[PDB]
Amino acid sequence: PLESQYQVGPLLGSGGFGSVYSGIRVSDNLPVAIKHVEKDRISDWGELPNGTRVPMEVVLLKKVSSGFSGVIRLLDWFERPDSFVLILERPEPVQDLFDFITERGALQEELARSFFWQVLEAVRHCHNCGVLHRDIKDENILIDLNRGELKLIDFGSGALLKDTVYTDFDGTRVYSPPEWIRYHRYHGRSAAVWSLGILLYDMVCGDIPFEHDEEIIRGQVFFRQRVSSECQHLIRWCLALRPSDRPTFEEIQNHPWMQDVLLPQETAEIHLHSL
Numbered sequence: 001p002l003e004s005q006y007q008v009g010p011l012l013g014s015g016g017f018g019s020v021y022s023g024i025r026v027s028d029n030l031p032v033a034i035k036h037v038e039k040d041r042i043s044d045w046g047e048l049p050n051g052t053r054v055p056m057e058v059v060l061l062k063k064v065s066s067g068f069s070g071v072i073r074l075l076d077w078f079e080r081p082d083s084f085v086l087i088l089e090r091p092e093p094v095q096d097l098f099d100f101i102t103e104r105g106a107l108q109e110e111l112a113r114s115f116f117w118q119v120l121e122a123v124r125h126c127h128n129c130g131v132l133h134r135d136i137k138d139e140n141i142l143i144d145l146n147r148g149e150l151k152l153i154d155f156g157s158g159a160l161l162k163d164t165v166y167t168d169f170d171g172t173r174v175y176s177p178p179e180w181i182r183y184h185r186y187h188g189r190s191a192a193v194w195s196l197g198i199l200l201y202d203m204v205c206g207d208i209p210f211e212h213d214e215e216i217i218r219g220q221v222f223f224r225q226r227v228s229s230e231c232q233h234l235i236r237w238c239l240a241l242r243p244s245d246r247p248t249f250e251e252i253q254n255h256p257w258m259q260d261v262l263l264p265q266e267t268a269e270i271h272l273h274s275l
């Protein structure tokens with residue numbers, strides 16, 4: 001047990017009410033993120049395979065951890081009287097997709113296609129593991145600036161994936177679909193695909209398409225930057241008003257705009273400058 005197996009560093013992130021510290025695993029120097037979660041604001045508890053009462057976030061992290069590098073891995077966790085503490089992998093150097101977009105504006109299609117594809121692979125891997133993220137967005141995506149690999153983070157609004165209707169939601173409103181806004185219901189996959197359309201527009205236009213409830217419900221997309229027709233068609237497809245008109249993961253990945261994606265390595269050399 002105990003907190004001498006990590007050395008705590010500076011607080012990460014530039015705002016918000018959460019607490020995440022840069023850390024280093026004393027045992028082997030592995031860089032890690034130390035995320036503190038308060039009991040008071042966990043609304044969702046689950047119970048572990050061996051049946052302990054933990055935050056849903058932990059149950060979901062444990063279900064998606066494993067060889068595949070597309071989701072940040074939970075390396076360990078500890079409970080305290082008033083909070084849980086989660087130890088996760090930390091790439092170094094790293095930058096979130098929100099900052100990266102703040103710095104570099106709208107991304108070339110080629111870089112968006114490669115980022116977007118790795119996001120699809122990560123989300124497929126969560127779904128495949130029985131986990132629904134429910135807050136896919138540029139702040140919840142890390143870029144490993146050296147290998148050009150993206151990593152999905154923050155399962156704090158997620159749920160077990162199921163085929164029936166969800167009537168609760170706690171993620172980011174401007175990424176949530178029109179069926180949630182109007183009826184307080186949605187289904188997992190189709191909701192996630194809407195958030196993927198918002199994300200792809202964000203990447204190619206440098207900002208999200210909708211801020212207000214009405215624009216979400218209206219679902220009309222205006223492009224403010226030059227964006228190929230195939231990419232605009234994928235986006236409008238993801239943002240179909242009717243859930244059953246959205247594409248599956250498989251159709252998104254077999255879309256003509258998704259062909260000939262760069263490997264992560266090439267993506268970092270070309271767009272992140274590696275060598």
Ligand SMILES: O=c1[nH]c(CN2CC[C@H](O)C2)nc2c1sc1ccc(Cl)cc12
Nearest residue numbers: 018020033072088089090139153154155
């Ligand atoms: O689960 C997380 N949450 C957050 C916090 N935030 C709340 C604001 C944003 O949604 C995400 N950061 C991280 C994680 S894992 C992780 C791993 C490496 C690094 Cl460098 C940061 C993080």
